[PDB]
Design a protein around this ligand. Structure first.
Ligand SMILES: Nc1ncnc2c1ncn2[C@@H]1O[C@H](COP(=O)(O)OP(=O)(O)OP(=O)(O)O)[C@@H](O)[C@H]1O
Ligand SMILES: Nc1ncnc2c1ncn2[C@@H]1O[C@H](COP(=O)(O)OP(=O)(O)OP(=O)(O)O)[C@@H](O)[C@H]1O
Ligand SMILES: Nc1ncnc2c1ncn2[C@@H]1O[C@H](COP(=O)(O)OP(=O)(O)OP(=O)(O)O)[C@@H](O)[C@H]1O
Ligand SMILES: Nc1ncnc2c1ncn2[C@@H]1O[C@H](COP(=O)(O)OP(=O)(O)OP(=O)(O)O)[C@@H](O)[C@H]1O
Ligand SMILES: NC(=O)c1ncn([C@@H]2O[C@H](COP(=O)(O)O)[C@@H](O)[C@H]2O)c1N
Ligand SMILES: NC(=O)c1ncn([C@@H]2O[C@H](COP(=O)(O)O)[C@@H](O)[C@H]2O)c1N
Ligand SMILES: NC(=O)c1ncn([C@@H]2O[C@H](COP(=O)(O)O)[C@@H](O)[C@H]2O)c1N
Ligand SMILES: NC(=O)c1ncn([C@@H]2O[C@H](COP(=O)(O)O)[C@@H](O)[C@H]2O)c1N
Ligand SMILES: [Cl-]
Ligand SMILES: [Cl-]
Ligand SMILES: [Cl-]
Ligand SMILES: [Cl-]
Ligand SMILES: [Cl-]
Ligand SMILES: [Cl-]
Ligand SMILES: [Cl-]
Ligand SMILES: [Cl-]
Lengths: 355, 355, 355, 355
């Protein structure tokens, strides 16, 4: 529901000489806040007892707004403090989750960096696939039912598993059922797709509405448990174990891509952006990520995406190989966001970046 | 035996205007020496013919003290040169090994950064486990004998192996016995623990006695041979080979952790420090490392630790994502050590950091 | 054929106040061009429609020379523009390929950084092995025929495979034959060598002819598809699949080596350089790479090498742990090349670095 | 005559990926060119034999366009090279002089940073006084004739002199007449104004059309010959000499103003800008200077001004106290100009800054 006018008229009552940058203390906040400080902003960090130490010891937040539980950040009391501090909120994974995507779309009355409407297209598998398909991006083949399996597939609902036949699908579904890991409701709505065999590149882009340009900021590969621990056990020992893979994100490793593939990398970003303009105006604003796998034919297949900042940007908080190229600076995604905010304020174009 | 008074009174006869930083040319010396230079110190590097090139070409040492063999660094001749150069020695893995931990505790009369007594708690498995257990840190389950195996275990004595049953334990012990890799004495004192299946995070902390604060400096994951080569062979081919895994440290890869896990990361550091104060006064001084595995339940299990600088700090000699956050600088662990030395000298608190 | 005199006399007609650095827009050009800009050069990038975006958005090239297809860069029309721009060309993988190594040796009349003759010793397996063998570097054992297989081997011709017996060799050769991946001509000239089981370190060196010194600039490990995707599938699932490994380079991951191994690392560089002086005068000039595997005995075995810049230097475009050590700068290989060019021009020694 | 459309349509045919910055090698070019390089531009310097050394040894120009004499820079041959190089010209004192202000207004068909029309308001004393008077800025009292002198005055036409009475005016005019320094035509059109007794502050501002903001970049005091040499002779010796003062600009000395006076400094800049918008649309663009004297009542009296970059910006080529404040950078006026050009190109607003 929340209008752009409701937001612009909230920001119009802001002290334009004291604009701060706020975010919830988690996910990617460390470089969101650091980047803001480095661009000259004073920063606000929503935190809580037990989870504030990293933000205190890294000295990255000027003002703390403590909540009883991160769920409270939707409360009207918290929205007010943020408005009185002249904060533009930078949204991220943990924030959307703890606040509630519905509360974010029509209950959170605080200016927010990015395209508020498009956060819904990252939450729903159908919208995401619609976007990527319509943008013209390679994705994994989808399988309507366990009976359609004709190759290796991954099945999504942590509770993940791999299958190479219909028979195997049920053997594993059942296994996870009796072990209490999975329930009938989950396996009823199982999502089955082609297992893509390749190298992981989570590609972090930035669309600048001020420059009308898609920029490449960096890349990481996921570090997931238990899978990355499992496959580090020799085959002979794996066969002697009764262990199922899980794919819980635990961290990130820096990576760069083969340079001849950057035209493809950029084209993918350009296409996603051009289509999202049509489907969800004004489209992508700021940080977005394509989570892909590079197959042996040097084709990037995207199995996921984000419409705001992805957690993997943490791998280059001190800048990376790509982010260096622009100005030879240790540029993080967090600082790139802050800069767009800085420039927008200076050019009187806050309306191109907030909603 | 070596007293703190024996050391303070050695340092009291130092030219306080010409304090240098010394270390043995190996392990982590490159950034120990670089960091020192960057903080304004002149540096001394103990080296030898055949092993001096890296320190010469990286231009990181101002004075070289050549020895016939690194074993000589315990010699009274070498301790004298170091004392005449006004050197505070920064200890590390290779230094403690080549010098001799016993020689270090009561025969090495040179001021040393860190808590000299606590180096013994990192050498002995019982002390280490006592510390970690008492600090309240998750560790792998220990197994008293091969007959207690009820899951997958790793067995330690390079000569390592994995077992999933009592039967397998002896099959493998025997295999390694007849191949000459392992002897009856080693397998008699075998250490058997739960094989933890997860992602490796070697977490490098710094406790500042001046600030009374535990800082997070960075993280690496180990790159070990042959294991990391072995598991890169496809399963079908592994099964056709007669090859045992080994876990010889060969290098390090940078990694960052999921941000929501930093409160846990920091809490672990805080607890280790608080307990080590009680058990080995004054406790941890400067660099320490928790070598952990993150399981699918997002719990960090520490299978090892160091009470001085860990080799994995080499992964961020040009700074890392975490070390950047403090001041936006390319800060290495070596430079963080040097700075504490700098600040201690300036505040007349050399007694808080040397022994 | 192309003489050093033919080249020096081409450069002698250059405007020495307007020397630019040129390269083809691919492979490693991003930091070749960035490094040049950072050293004060104006830069020329050969590019084409569809592949120019990365070089435009990273703002790394001052002048673009567009070609219809990268194959045209051999054309006399293109050599002229480069000569009129006073360009010294920095050669790399994609450039030598698209231009043609034969065209490079005697048809490309443009000054070029490096030793032009030695590019042939990197293209031919016999010359390379001669060099490495004569330099005294550990290499994988070679196998004359499938009948000599007495261990695990890798077989080279993407079309690669692993074998542990003569029987397996033919089973797999045949498999790849009927699947259309491999033809009789390829398997007739198959190269069979010892499969080395260890950790990958692609070591990037720089030989400075001005300083007569081999420098260590950085290291990466390869990120290859599908192999690195394949071995991330649990063993039980791999066995259920009919999938062959491929080793297509897709990207790079940063790594550092155990510090005690740097004397070996440096010695290897020193030896390769000393022998290449004898075998191909003046020897190595500028960037060269040893692609190695570290076995459990801590011995580096080199399975490949380059005589110019290797693609893995892309992992440290913002500098790395080793490159930092010299001057505490974010130094890339591209900038190190540019600097040697800068210094050579300033000292009137362009003849030590071009040909 | 030259239209904005004539210029925009010249720039519209420019290769927008290869925009360079050009200027004549004199006046303030060193930091104009340096600043451009620092912002990523390739630079063009118009120079000539005998006057090119500073630009060559400071390594500040990528391309040289040599002319026979600086007067040639109006020639259509030179305008073409500049257009083929995609140069935006940055105008300055020596350029306007050597080219010819009339040639600049309607014969110089090359895009130019700044407001082309307003260069005429800096050349004509009546326009300048109109502007400053209408802006509401304190100026020295004007005197219509030698008979109106009722205080100390300075008389302008190098050929300058000071008078405290009508009688003295003629005594000195005559003196300079018989010495050949001055001719009847000059003294016929003599400009007589109040001698202001105070401290010199040449204040360098920058109006950003993109930000709609007047910025303070720095300040210098003039170093003039022979006057600054004359007044360094003790009074007793001056009285024994037959020497007239001259005020030939020879150099600049850095100075900062009393901080409580910055509101006045800024207000003066704001007023000049607001009025110049009305009188010469779009008004001031980029660099402008108020040359003032601070009297004992702490009032700044402006005796001169420039509508483009003033020579005194040379005093802070490595940045100054004021220019540092924005981002803690060594920011020169030349780099501030280049940045506005950079930002304009990126935001597609080249029309706000060129003409
Ligand atoms: N089509 C696929 N083929 C092969 N592996 C896949 C595929 N899809 C997902 N995976 C693996 O499962 C992991 C989790 O994928 P998922 O689709 O859950 O991403 P996500 O929802 O963005 O979760 P996260 O936020 O933790 O990245 C991926 O990182 C990848 O390793
Ligand atoms: N409990 C465990 N579960 C799973 N893997 C383990 C466990 N303990 C050790 N490993 C593996 O064995 C390797 C060597 O562990 P070890 O306990 O020998 O560490 P260390 O003595 O500190 O040796 P290094 O100094 O080389 O790190 C670890 O890096 C890890 O990969
Ligand atoms: N002797 C070997 N033992 C084990 N693995 C090997 C061996 N030789 C090659 N490999 C694996 O195959 C990959 C490709 O090796 P190859 O010899 O084709 O290198 P290359 O020709 O330099 O190709 P690229 O330019 O892509 O690195 C290596 O990166 C390595 O992972
Ligand atoms: N009204 C005044 N009162 C006192 N001194 C003055 C006055 N006007 C000028 N001067 C002195 O004469 C010098 C030259 O002033 P002038 O008006 O010629 O400046 P200009 O034309 O901008 O020359 P330049 O470009 O060399 O600064 C000034 O720097 C100042 O020292
Ligand atoms: N890549 C990362 O480091 C990362 N960190 C977090 N995330 C995603 O963000 C979500 C919220 O993070 P958290 O559960 O740590 O609060 C997680 O469910 C996960 O999908 C990531 N992908
Ligand atoms: N992680 C590392 O790079 C590392 N480098 C050395 N070490 C430890 O330090 C000890 C001494 O090192 P060295 O053997 O290279 O002299 C080794 O036995 C090993 O346990 C490490 N963990
Ligand atoms: N390591 C790399 O990133 C890399 N990038 C390219 N290359 C080599 O350079 C050759 C040419 O590269 P390209 O095919 O991207 O033009 C490739 O065949 C490959 O052997 C590499 N090794
Ligand atoms: N302040 C200076 O350094 C300065 N340098 C030059 N100028 C002005 O620029 C005019 C042109 O300079 P030049 O004569 O050096 O070519 C000079 O007549 C003088 O009025 C200055 N004010
Ligand atoms: Cl992102
Ligand atoms: Cl995320
Ligand atoms: Cl450590
Ligand atoms: Cl260690
Ligand atoms: Cl290289
Ligand atoms: Cl290569
Ligand atoms: Cl100015
Ligand atoms: Cl001037």
């Amino acid at each position: 529901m929340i209008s752009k006018d409701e937001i612009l008229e909230i920001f119009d009552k802001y002290n334009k000489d004291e604009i701060t940058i706020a975010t919830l203390g988690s996910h990617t906040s460390l470089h969101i806040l650091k980047g803001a400080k480095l661009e000259g902003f004073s920063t606000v960090c929503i935190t809580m007892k037990g989870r504030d130490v990293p933000y205190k010891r890294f000295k990255v937040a000027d003002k703390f707004i403590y909540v009883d539980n991160f769920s409270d950040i939707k409360n009207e009391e918290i929205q007010e403090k943020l408005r009185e501090l002249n904060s533009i909120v930078v949204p991220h994974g943990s924030f959307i989750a703890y606040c509630g995507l519905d509360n974010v779309e029509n209950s959170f009355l605080v200016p927010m960096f990015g395209n508020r409407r498009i956060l819904r297209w990252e939450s729903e598998r159908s919208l995401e696939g619609k976007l990527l398909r319509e943008a013209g991006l390679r994705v994994p083949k989808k399988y309507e039912s366990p009976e359609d399996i004709d190759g290796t597939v991954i099945v999504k609902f942590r509770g993940y598993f791999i299958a190479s036949s219909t028979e195997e699908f049920y053997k594993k579904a059942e296994d996870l059922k009796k072990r209490g890991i999975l329930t009938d409701e989950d396996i009823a709505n199982a999502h089955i797709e082609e297992y893509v065999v390749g190298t992981n590149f989570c590609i972090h882009y930035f669309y600048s509405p001020l420059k009308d340009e898609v920029e490449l900021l960096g890349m990481d590969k996921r570090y997931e448990s238990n899978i990355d621990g499992l496959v580090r056990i020799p085959a002979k020992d794996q066969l002697e174990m009764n262990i199922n893979p899980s794919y819980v994100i635990t961290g990130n490793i820096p990576v760069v891509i083969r340079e001849s593939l950057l035209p493809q990398v950029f084209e993918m970003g350009d296409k996603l952006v051009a289509k999202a303009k049509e489907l969800v105006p004004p489209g992508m604003i700021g940080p977005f990520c394509l989570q892909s796998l590079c197959n042996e034919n040097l084709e990037l297949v995207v199995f996921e995406m984000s419409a705001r900042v992805d957690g993997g940007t943490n791998s280059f908080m001190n800048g990376g190989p790509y982010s260096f190229l622009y100005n030879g600076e240790p540029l993080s995604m967090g600082q790139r966001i802050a800069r767009e905010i800085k420039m927008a304020l200076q050019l009187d174009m806050i309306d191109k970046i907030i909603s």
